[PDB]
Design a protein around this nucleic acid. Structure first.
Lengths: 124, 155, 252, 66
RNA sequence: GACUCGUUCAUACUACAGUGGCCACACCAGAUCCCAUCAGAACUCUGAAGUUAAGCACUGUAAGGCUUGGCUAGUACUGAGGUGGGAGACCGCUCGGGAACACCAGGUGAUGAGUCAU
RNA sequence: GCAGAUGUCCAAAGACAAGCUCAAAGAGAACAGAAAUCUCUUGUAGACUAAAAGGGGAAAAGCUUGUUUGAUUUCUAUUU
RNA sequence: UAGAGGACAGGGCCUUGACCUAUUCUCAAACUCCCAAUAGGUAAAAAGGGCGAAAUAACUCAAUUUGU
């Protein structure tokens, strides 16, 4: 089939909570980790985070591999090291909930759920 | 003390339950010609071209047609006399009136009816029949279903 | 709490069917179909361009109360008989489909000889307005390829020049209309790695086309398209729930 | 001192004493502020009609009165 | 058997299931080019290796909702009359009009123009 | 009479277009906690829309962005 | 206003609550899914309507003959 659970998205998060200097350094570390520019948080500017996909995401997750509760009921997970990994994984066909023209919802048969997410984590 | 434009229109100018949202695209295809009748039903979703409170639910004749608006002559009662008022609205707030639809259908139906009757040279009465007293009827009912009725006691 | 409450369902108002399906905008639609009420019997033709991920389609529509009437219609799959056997989703295919719709419409109206359109690719004509169709209108979108095709076919479709590939680049427009970008992708893929090239343009090879023949197969396609345009009722429901209840008595 | 602020008493019967007069509803209405570029073209239409009629009338009158 | 543009705007929605794909819709492969971002996710472009898992279509549920009919009920309320009753609150009679919530039952769509495939 | 509001405010909070969807909840992630940021799910508006209150609004009338000055000159038919 | 059933907080498996689900007693001039009676509006043909031809126009339309 095509029911395989792939890493849809991996998001690195750095919540510094203050102004620049340290925020710019936190941007630099995310830059060297992944060659794409980061994005800053709220300006109520307090955090930097970036999104990666595909082979780079898989390699970064492999580097971060170094628990069976950090899994969400919707079938995602994350951890920390200082910085935060969060991987949202899904089956193929997730496009139908994100595309503009015929946007719709996948059935819970197609949704990943925590059991399948755990099994995928142990298999990878 | 307070007499603004939309004063008193809390309920009249509110969309009905589960009937909110802009008008259907089909409303813009409604054909309007000069001199035909029209109802003024304010559509609160469209704020421009909105008629005054009084004219909601009034029928008038078209006297002017613009690119997106209609001018309609409406009778308004002002103390001791009626007078025509030229109300200018947008097309969303106006709707073709069925006030004379039976008249138009009657005109066509009677046209063909009296055409065929005059062909067969019969003098026919064409006016509406204002039905009144019904004739006698010799009607039989099976006695197995004639129910006797008595007033009921109190409980 | 539950948000999907019975009260929530009671108070819910559904969108229009086509909005729920994500087909029509319903704001662009009425801005497109609304005509001045001074103008009586003014049709306001709409040139609908819709691109599936298999082929593009173009049609001429006139809005009517009972439902739109389609006066002309062309699909990219018709280019098989006009000599284009592959790439029915290209900028070039969209151009050709628009050309087909325009020429066929004019032929149905008996107006080809009075509206020849342009020759090759650099009384008032029929006026139609382009219908977007949800797609984002970036510079280089194929809807404007189809619009250019219909303008070259002879229809008057009002448009700016800002959305052709390049914000104006007539040469780039021409090369995309003849699919020179597809040919150039073929060249680069062949030069760098033949395996990716032959796994990407597999059906192109199976058609024995040339990266140097994409152009010509589009030009002669243009000339030869110009030259010739189940149900269950309460009884069964009751009986079936009776038997399901009787079964659930023993099994569970 | 204090007085009656307002009343509509007797107003309806005053209104009906001389009846509720209706608008006259004349056959023609002024086109002054109505649809320019349509009523101007109607002016041109009518001028053409009048000239075409009047030249026939002049021809017939001249040929019947020598 | 499908698609595009529509109409009606829940009998059309929602949840959970089951079934299905000649072309067809799609998911899907990719990022040189137009274009696009933190991110080819989206959008845009170029494809045709895979797949009905999903979207999509059809069906099911003593399903919710919606809709129709019944019943609530000539009940509530109400127009006109009364030198009617009653201390009053209120309540009849005469000539008329007539609900709602709830509950019960059936149903869960229909359709205009054009086109593809066989 | 009752509950209130007005003598303002705005080069954007005006104009147009595009993209996006809000409040809130739940689950999950180093520091990080009832609250910081990030991810998913549900989400008919329970947000926002300068201000009183009432209407209207979801591929918007809300949010973000881009370009702007139609907050321009003149004149009608008119509504309150 | 009352209880009934149930996976977070607290104390000693228990209890207190919170919260959730289905119920329950009672209400609104500035509440409304629904919704009367009465009151209100428009129409019910001749200076008009229907159906055709022929003219006119600088309007409208792709249309010197589309439409009005």
């Amino acid at each position: 089939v095509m029911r395989e659970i792939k890493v849809n998205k991996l998001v690195l998060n750095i919540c510094v909570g203050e102004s620049g200097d340290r925020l710019t350094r936190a941007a630099r570390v995310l830059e060297q980790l992944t060659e794409q520019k980061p994005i800053f948080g709220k300006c109520r500017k307090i955090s930097c985070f970036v999104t990666v996909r595909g082979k780079k995401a898989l390699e970064i997750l492999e580097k971060g591999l170094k628990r069976r509760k950090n899994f969400s009921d919707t079938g995602n997970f994350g951890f920390g090291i200082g910085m935060d990994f969060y991987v949202h994984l899904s089956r193929s066909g997730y496009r139908v909930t994100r595309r503009t023209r015929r946007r719709s919802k996948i059935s819970k048969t197609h949704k990943v759920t925590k059991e399948d997410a755990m099994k995928w984590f142990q298999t990878k | 003390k307070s007499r603004g434009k939309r004063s008193g229109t809390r309920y009249k100018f509110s969309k009905k339950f589960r009937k909110h949202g802009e008008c259907t695209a089909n409303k813009y295809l409604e054909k309007l010609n000069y001199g035909d009748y029209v109802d003024i039903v304010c559509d609160s979703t469209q704020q421009k071209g909105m008629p005054f409170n009084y004219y909601h639910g009034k029928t008038g004749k078209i006297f002017h047609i613009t690119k997106r608006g209609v001018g309609v002559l409406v009778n308004k009662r002002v103390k001791h006399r009626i007078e025509q008022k030229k109300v200018c609205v947008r097309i969303e707030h106006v709707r073709k009136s069925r006030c004379n639809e039976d008249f138009l259908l009657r005109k066509i139906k009677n046209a063909e009816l009296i055409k065929e009757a005059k062909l067969k040279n019969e003098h026919i009465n064409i006016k509406r029949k204002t039905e009144g007293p019904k004739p006698a009827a010799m009607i039989k009912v099976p006695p197995s279903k004639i129910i006797t009725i008595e007033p009921l006691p109190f409980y | 709490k539950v948000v999907k409450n019975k009260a929530y369902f009671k108070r819910y108002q559904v969108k229009y069917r086509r909005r729920r399906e994500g087909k029509t905008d319903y704001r662009a639609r009425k801005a497109l179909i609304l005509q001045d009420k001074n103008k009586y019997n003014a049709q306001k033709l709409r040139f609908v361009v819709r691109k599936t991920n298999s082929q593009v389609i173009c049609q001429i529509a006139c809005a009517h109360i009972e439902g739109d009437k389609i006066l002309a219609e062309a699909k990219s799959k018709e280019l098989i008989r006009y000599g284009i056997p592959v790439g029915l989703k290209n900028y070039a295919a969209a151009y050709a489909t628009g050309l087909l719709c325009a020429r066929r419409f004019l032929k149905s109206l008996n107006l080809d000889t009075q509206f020849l359109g342009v020759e090759k690719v650099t009384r008032k004509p029929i006026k139609a307005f382009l219908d977007v169709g949800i797609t984002r209108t970036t510079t280089g979108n194929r809807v404007f390829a189809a619009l250019k095709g219909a303008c070259d076919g002879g229809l008057n479709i009002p448009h700016g020049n800002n959305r052709f590939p390049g914000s104006f680049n007539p040469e780039q427009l021409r090369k995309n209309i003849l699919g020179i970008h597809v040919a150039e992708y073929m060249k680069t893929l062949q030069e760098e790695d033949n395996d990716k090239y032959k796994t990407h343009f597999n059906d192109y090879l199976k058609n024995n086309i040339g990266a140097d023949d994409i152009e010509q197969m589009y030009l002669n396609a243009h000339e030869k398209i110009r030259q010739n345009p189940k149900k269950l009722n309460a009884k069964l429901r009751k009986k079936r729930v009776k038997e399901k209840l009787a079964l659930y008595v023993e099994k569970l | 001192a204090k007085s009656k602020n307002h009343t509509n008493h007797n107003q309806n019967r005053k209104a009906h004493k001389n009846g509720i007069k209706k608008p006259k509803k004349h056959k023609f209405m002024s086109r002054k502020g109505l649809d320019p570029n349509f009523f101007r073209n109607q002016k041109y239409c009518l001028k053409g009609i009048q000239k075409k009629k009047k030249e026939l009338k002049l021809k017939a009158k001249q040929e019947k009165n020598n």
